[PDB]
Amino acid sequence: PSEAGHRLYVKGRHLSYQRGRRNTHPKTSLIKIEGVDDTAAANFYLGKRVAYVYRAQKEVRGTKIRVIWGKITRPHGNSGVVRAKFTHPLPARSFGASVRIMLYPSSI
Amino acid sequence: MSSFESVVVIDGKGHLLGRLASIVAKQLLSGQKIVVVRCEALNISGEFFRAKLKYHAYLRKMTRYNPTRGGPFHFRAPSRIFYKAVRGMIPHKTARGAAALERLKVFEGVPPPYDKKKKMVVPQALRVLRLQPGRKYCTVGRLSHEVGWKYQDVVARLEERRKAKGAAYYERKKLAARQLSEAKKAAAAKVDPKVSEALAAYGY
Amino acid sequence: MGRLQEYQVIGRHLPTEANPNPALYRMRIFAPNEVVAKSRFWYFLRGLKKVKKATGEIVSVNVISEKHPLKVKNFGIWLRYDSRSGTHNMYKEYRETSRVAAVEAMYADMAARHRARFRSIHILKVVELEKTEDVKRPYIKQLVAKNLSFPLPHRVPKISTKKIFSAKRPSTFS
Amino acid sequence: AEINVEATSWRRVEVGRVLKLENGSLAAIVEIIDHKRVLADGPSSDPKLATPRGIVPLSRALLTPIVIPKLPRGARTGAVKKAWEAYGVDAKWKETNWAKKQLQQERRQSLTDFDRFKVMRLKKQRRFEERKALAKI
Amino acid sequence: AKSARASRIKENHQRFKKNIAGPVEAARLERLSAKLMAIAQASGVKSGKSIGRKDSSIVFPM
Amino acid sequence: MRYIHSEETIPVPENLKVSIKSRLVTVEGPRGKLQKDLSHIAVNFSVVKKGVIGLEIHHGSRKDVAALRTVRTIINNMIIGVTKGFKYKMRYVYAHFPINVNVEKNAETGCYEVEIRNFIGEKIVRKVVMAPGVEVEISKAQKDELILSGNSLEAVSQSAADIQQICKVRNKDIRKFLDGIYVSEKGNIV
Amino acid sequence: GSLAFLPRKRAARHRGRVKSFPKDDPKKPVHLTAAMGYKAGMTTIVRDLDRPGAKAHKKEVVEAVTIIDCPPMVVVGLVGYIETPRG
Amino acid sequence: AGTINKPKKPTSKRKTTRLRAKISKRAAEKKRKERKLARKNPEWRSKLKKDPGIPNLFPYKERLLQQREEERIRRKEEL
RNA sequence: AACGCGACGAUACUACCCGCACGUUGUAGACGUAUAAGAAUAGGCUCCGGCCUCGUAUCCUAGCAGGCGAUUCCUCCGCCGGCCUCGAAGUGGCCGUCGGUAAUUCGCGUAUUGCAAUUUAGACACGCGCGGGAUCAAAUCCUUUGCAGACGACUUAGAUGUG
């Protein structure tokens, strides 16, 4: 009985698109990494895989879970928020929804 | 340090109403569920009659043709005063804004589900850390009682029952801590020599 | 205001056939950089004297550094500022470590207390009070008291602004 | 006449009071500039506890329970260093609770992945004896 | 004239309620309660003395 | 101007016991015990010598320093109350209708009650309930005199004011109608 | 008209609810508060008035009274309420 | 006054843009009239202005006045 | 409040309750979703020794996604009962039975998913199935009533009866 965890990823939250006062740009998203509070801490996560895991209705090829893959591109602001670019823009209904930030490609 | 939790139960005592609401609103839009307890113990800066003057001016604003529908529904409970502040801080006329409000819960006192949970505090909204020592402040419970809130005494009695049970729990709590220290002392002389400095060298 | 250094600016009128070897005036100017230091030289000279930039020449710009930037000193500043009523004399005292520190505090203090701007203030004299008994202002006089020692009641702790939620109520005693 | 007062016992900023900065370094107050700033100097031989002579704001500092007894006002680096070594500020600071907590933090940060596994295994063995003792009482 | 919610009228009514109306209504209540008294008098888990459980929400579903 | 230090002193006599918590002051004396909460004022309390209480404030303004003067006299008044006490003497005067004053002590709530009758011939009975710890007696030394004494100056003075206000003439001439109950002398019991 | 009775709609029920029982303190003896009856009609009475200070004092007055038929009520249950922050 | 219990109509601080242009035109018009009136200037203007001099609370007024006095004398004898 | 809530009565099928078997079922979004004193902030906590900037803390945390057999251990976890306790929008404690259980140390097994591809794994609700227990209901139309009424609505009465 291991009674332990299996988490190899850092938790994140999809806050919003890259936006101005009025105009929003779905191509780039903003992610809040848990425990990341400054730009120095965010620099560790640039270039890391980020996957949005959600559930669907129809089983396509053995699962109902679909994944959208992206990367952490650059830090946003001064509060540890990062910018992410995915294969497709996130559904925009996933504002405030969990994302997975993987530890690869690693350089440590 | 930006941790994510199932629900953060905030002890509303000693908090400035607006500053707590702004922080609560940002967390709700980010996707975090918030429960605020003891809204009657919240604080509003400035003198009391200024808070009373604002609410009476709020009572002025009423729809002329039909007060039943459309008009500003004035809520006298302390939690709904806090909820009004949070609602004005959230785009409640959107689907995203309504979903954010579903992550919020406000109460008078500490209902029995939450009287056994850990109440967090928001330092940025704490009155003792924010207000200049000479300035005046007022309590939301006092303003609510003066505008029509009917349940000030009932909430007060339930707090007395709640804190009496807390006294018994703390007496039990101190007994366990005393027993833990004694057990720790007895084991420390029997566990091992070699293990001891290994923990100490590692900081544990 | 900003970050300032004392500047020794020596300038002269351009030598003509009738007047070779001109007067070589000098001023001490508090400016953020050398570009501003020369501008204030010609602005002040245009008022005082009849020498303009076109017929002028900057001989030298030098930085005056404080001799002892580790000794606590009391400074007295005699300044004139103009308001909606007119131009007023005021004498004020600043306890600092350098003259530039004293002048920077003066600009902040005049802006806070009288809404006076940089373009409105003329610094007529900054002097180190060589000894106590030269301190006239009670706020400086209390700092030069014998055996000064005070507590720091109601000290608000520094909590990271990104640490939204705290488990314990903070204390304001140390 | 009986008077019993329990109000507060603060630590006073005064000449000779050594204060702790955020860097973990120490500095003794040499002169009080105003109610918000002081002039300090840390002559400790330890590079971690050393502080260059200069102005330190009191918001950025913390008052330690150590006071050099008769430090002269305006004393320069040579005079302050003589009092620092004579009083033994480094030895007294190392015995303080603040330094012990800071040392504990430093050891825990330097832990590697293998050390965390060892800490967990060694703590469980310690916990096993603690649980047996608590069972008796 | 003095309104029905005048402070002075309330004070006078309070004295009347305490010094005249009170004793009369107290005597009436004693007689009425006596008549209703006459009519009426005419293991914890297994016994119910231990009050146990019979047979939208307030918390978020975990 | 943010004065760095300002302090005051309250000497205590030998027969007192000043127990002061955070800012709750309790003074026990031969006459009794007084208590008062002054947590609304930022003040640091201390013992400077054997029998003098020191109160100081650090980094305050003129408003904050001046507040120490009020605290000094308030605690001093509680010291006087437990040692010497306070006494207020009232005289009631009339032209034609003699004022009837009745003083009784009731068991419930333990407070003295002063009942006034025949004020300018009025049929209303005016009842004033004294503050707790305030004793009222009719002196058999002067005619139409009411003695009001206790341990708290505020309770004694306020209760004397309550009697004066209730017996106030209305819709008449102040220059012609002189009836009423007035405070005559103020001082200490001892 | 009066705006205190403004929603001049039909009553939601034919019976009518008390909406307020007198305030309770434990010192008085145990008693009931309300009862039901059926309206029968009106009739005229003659009363020997004993109103000190009235013009009809020590005189006979004719008044209109209403009769309510009141068969005894049967107690068939018991209900308990608790105080909440919501009433 | 019973303002707390029964407050009256608020005084709006929301600026209407009609006033703002009207408020800016008057500021421009008033500034022009000052410049025109200062041009007519039937009033005497002098060269040397009333210098208030060194403040009395300046601790070194002795040395500065002695400095100024000897500055005048040395310049006078040199010229 | 016709999209606020509570208590109670009777609920025919459907499936009302219980157990487990899954769902190519829905979820503004599990992945250790761990952590109850009260009160003051010009003071407080204590085991009465002392302690308090600091939750960068405490607990839990190893094993084919966590096997099998030992060595060794009375530590922790879970289900059922019995006694009680929890009502502000209702639960936890104690005892007993049974089941599991690295605190120490081993033996056997892991390969091949081929150099990464959400590590499809939680909770609630809903539905489909068995096998055990349980129940045999109402409302409306209709006729009637006038305490009601523009029409609906409403107060009534229609099963043997004071109809």
Q: How far apart are CA D69 and CA D92, in angstroms?
A: 14
The CA–CA distances, whole Å, from F8 to C60, D5, F45, F125 equal 60, 15, 10, 48
C-alpha radius of gyration, chain E, whole number: 25
| Phi and psi, residue D54, nearest 5° | 175, -175
**Residue B35 · residue B9 · CB < 8 Å:** yes
Residue H2 forms contact with B (CB below 8 Å) = no
Q: Do C89 and H57 touch (CB under 8 A)?
A: no
**Residue D16 · residue D92 · CB < 8 Å:** no
Partners of residue F90 on adjacent β-strands: F146, F183
Q: What residue has its CA nearest to the C1' of I44?
A: C171
Residue E32 forms contact with G (CB below 8 Å) = yes
> CA–C1' span, B127 to I58, in Å?
28
Q: How far apart are CA F88 and CA F137, in angstroms?
A: 11
Closest to C59 measured CA to CA, from C25, C33, C36, C30? C25
Q: What are the structure tokens assigned to D61, written together? A: 């500092």
Look up residue G23 and give its DSSP letter.
Answer: P
CA C13, C18, C21, C27 dihedral sign is: negative
Q: How far apart are CA H39 and CA H34, in angstroms?
A: 8
Is chain D adjacent to chain B, meaning 3+ CB pairs within 8 angstroms? yes
Q: How far apart are CA F64 and CA F41, in angstroms?
A: 9
Q: How far apart are CA G82 and CA H14, in angstroms?
A: 50
Which residues in chain B have Cβ-Cβ distances shorter than 8 Å to H1? Answer: none
Cα C35 to chain center, whole Å? 18
Closest to H56 measured CA to CA, from C90, C102, C121? C90
Q: How far apart are CA D62 and CA D81, in angstroms?
A: 21
For B84, the enclosing helix (H) or strand (E) is helix B78-88
State the nucleotide closest to E62 in CA–C1' terms.
Answer: I123
| Phi and psi, residue B106, nearest 5° | -130, 140
- Sole residue written with tokens 């005016």: F126
β-pairing, B7-11 vs B33-37, is parallel
Q: How far apart are CA F39 and CA F61, in angstroms?
A: 18
The CA–CA distances, whole Å, from A107 to A46, A48, B82 equal 11, 10, 48
- DSSP class per residue in G35-64: ---EEEEEEEEEEE---TTSTTTTSEEEEE
The answer, yes or no, to whether the previous bond of H59 is cis (omega within 30 of 0) is no
Q: How far apart are CA B180 and CA B178, in angstroms?
A: 5
Q: How far apart are CA C153 and CA F59, in angstroms?
A: 9
**Residue C110 · residue C44 · CB < 8 Å:** no
**Residue B71 · residue B63 · CB < 8 Å:** yes
Look up residue A22 and give its DSSP letter.
Answer: S
Q: How far apart are CA D16 and CA F187, in angstroms?
A: 53
CA A23, A29, A34, A36 dihedral sign is: negative
**Entry field: residues in chain H:** 79
Q: How far apart are CA B184 and CA B188, in angstroms?
A: 6
The experimental technique used to determine this model is cryo-EM
Q: Do C129 and H59 touch (CB under 8 A)?
A: yes
**Residue C79 · residue C123 · CB < 8 Å:** yes
Q: How far apart are CA F169 and CA H23, in angstroms?
A: 58
Cα B70 to chain center, whole Å? 31
Strand order in the sheet with C87-96: C87-96, C73-82, C121-128
> CA–C1' span, H60 to I136, in Å?
114
Q: How far apart are CA G52 and CA C53, in angstroms?
A: 111
Closest to D48 measured CA to CA, from D26, D19, D66? D26
The 10 Å Cβ neighbour count of residue F144 is 15
**Residue C106 · residue C57 · CB < 8 Å:** no
Q: Do C142 and F59 touch (CB under 8 A)?
A: no
For D56, the enclosing helix (H) or strand (E) is strand D51-57
The CA–CA distances, whole Å, from C9 to C79, C107, C124, D59 equal 20, 21, 16, 38
Closest to B162 measured CA to CA, from B120, B204, B199, B107? B107
Size of interface E-G (CB pairs under 8 A): 13
| Beta-carbon contacts of residue B166 (< 8 Å; ≥ 6 apart) | B115
Helices (H), H1-79: 17-40, 61-78
Cα distance from B145 to chain F (closest Cα, Å)?
23
Resolution in A: 2.7
Residue D2 forms contact with F (CB below 8 Å) = yes
| Phi and psi, residue C133, nearest 5° | 80, -10
Taking CA C79 as the corner, what is the angle to CA C77 and CA C83, rounded to the nearest 5 degrees?
Answer: 145
Q: Greatest CA span in chain H, whole angstroms?
A: 82
DSSP helix/strand/coil, B110? coil
| Beta-carbon contacts of residue F60 (< 8 Å; ≥ 6 apart) | F2, F3, F6, F42
| Beta-carbon contacts of residue B62 (< 8 Å; ≥ 6 apart) | B71, B72
Closest to D44 measured CA to CA, from D14, D73, D60, D64? D64
Q: How far apart are CA D67 and CA H21, in angstroms?
A: 66
Q: At what angle do helices E7-19 and E21-41 cross, to 10 degrees?
A: 50
Q: How far apart are CA F91 and CA F178, in angstroms?
A: 12
Partners of residue F26 on adjacent β-strands: F19, F35
| Residue F188 identity | N
| Beta-carbon contacts of residue D57 (< 8 Å; ≥ 6 apart) | D36, D37
Nearest residue in chain D measured CA to CA from C154: D10
Q: Do H4 and B57 touch (CB under 8 A)?
A: no
Residue H11 forms contact with B (CB below 8 Å) = no
Q: Do B187 and D107 touch (CB under 8 A)?
A: no
- DSSP class per residue in B45-65: ES-HHHHHHHHHHHHH---SS
Q: At what angle do helices D113-136 and B193-201 cross, to 10 degrees?
A: 130
Q: Do F22 and D5 touch (CB under 8 A)?
A: no
Q: How far apart are CA D87 and CA D69, in angstroms?
A: 8
* SS3 per residue for B67-82: CCCCCCCCCCCHHHHH
| Beta-carbon contacts of residue B72 (< 8 Å; ≥ 6 apart) | B58, B61, B62, B63
Q: How many CA atoms lie within 13 A of C120 on its CB side?
A: 17
G52 burial type by CB count under 10 A (0-12 exposed, 13-18 middle, 19+ buried) = exposed
Closest to B73 measured CA to CA, from B87, B89, B93? B87
| Beta-carbon contacts of residue B126 (< 8 Å; ≥ 6 apart) | B14, B15, B16, C169, C170
For D121, the enclosing helix (H) or strand (E) is helix D113-136
E strands within C14-164? 25-31, 56-64, 73-82, 87-96, 121-128
> CA–C1' span, E62 to I122, in Å?
9
Q: What are the structure tokens assigned to A14, written together? A: 């999809």
Nearest residue in chain B measured CA to CA from F64: B134
Q: What are the structure tokens assigned to C171, written together? A: 């204390």
Q: How far apart are CA E58 and CA B113, in angstroms?
A: 8
**Residue C10 · residue C59 · CB < 8 Å:** yes
As a dihedral over the C-alpha atoms of residue C84, residue C89, residue C92, residue C97, rounded to 10 degrees, the angle is 100
- DSSP class per residue in chain F: --EEEEEEEEE--TT-EEEE-SSEEEEE-SS-EEEEE-TTS--EEEE-SSSEEEEEEEEE-HHHHHHHHHHHHHHHHHHHHHHT-EEEEEEEE-SSSPPEEEEEE-SGGG-EEEEEE-STT----EEEEPPTTEEEEE-SSSTTEEEEEES-HHHHHHHHHHHHHHT---SS-TTT---EEEEEEEE---
Q: How far apart are CA C64 and CA C37, in angstroms?
A: 13
Which residues in chain G have Cβ-Cβ distances shorter than 8 Å to E30? Answer: 29
The CA–CA distances, whole Å, from A72 to A81, B61, C110 equal 10, 50, 49
